[PDB]
Amino acid sequence: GSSGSSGSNTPSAEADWSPGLELHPDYKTWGPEQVCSFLRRGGFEEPVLLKNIRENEITGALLPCLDESRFENLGVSSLGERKKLLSYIQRLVQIHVDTMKVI
């Protein structure tokens, strides 16, 4: 077999910590805080979107509860955005509190 590969660029930071490690397993207690970060992981970085999260105390337990119309009121007034967000939150509940667990 073929083995061997040289070539590496210079790093930027060398520490034992990162701005993104993981989140709490109990999304039910994510509150308006974690939720404001969860969306950021999907690609959504809108201020109005994360703003409503604190204005409505939106929590992880409510994430899967909100629907298209809801998101449209939370600031996600976009046919494409919602279409993505809706499917996004789905990837959460489908994993969290699921009979099957995986790292």
Side-chain angles (χ1 to χ4, degrees):
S2 165
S3 53
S5 52
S6 61
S8 163
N9 204 45
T10 302
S12 295
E14 310 199 86
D16 317 278
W17 171 100
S18 261
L21 309 320
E22 71 177 349
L23 271 160
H24 230 254
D26 273 54
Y27 79 125
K28 300 183 116 198
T29 183
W30 265 8
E33 315 207 308
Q34 275 98 107
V35 176
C36 273
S37 139
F38 172 66
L39 304 147
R40 305 276 270 291
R41 311 201 72 71
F44 314 103
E45 306 194 63
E46 176 191 285
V48 183
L49 171 52
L50 309 155
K51 171 183 119 164
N52 261 291
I53 300 299
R54 298 173 86 185
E55 293 210 334
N56 293 278
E57 283 189 291
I58 297 300
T59 75
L62 297 185
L63 257 180
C65 238
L66 304 154
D67 321 323
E68 225 133 29
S69 269
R70 289 281 221 279
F71 299 128
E72 182 180 316
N73 262 8
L74 299 174
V76 191
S77 36
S78 261
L79 194 286
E81 294 280 271
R82 297 197 292 278
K83 278 259 209 214
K84 303 145 85 77
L85 234 113
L86 269 154
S87 213
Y88 185 49
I89 296 149
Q90 291 269 303
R91 93 199 300 180
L92 182 154
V93 280
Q94 80 171 226
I95 308 177
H96 269 138
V97 201
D98 182 58
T99 169
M100 294 286 105
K101 58 181 274 172
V102 66
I103 61 92

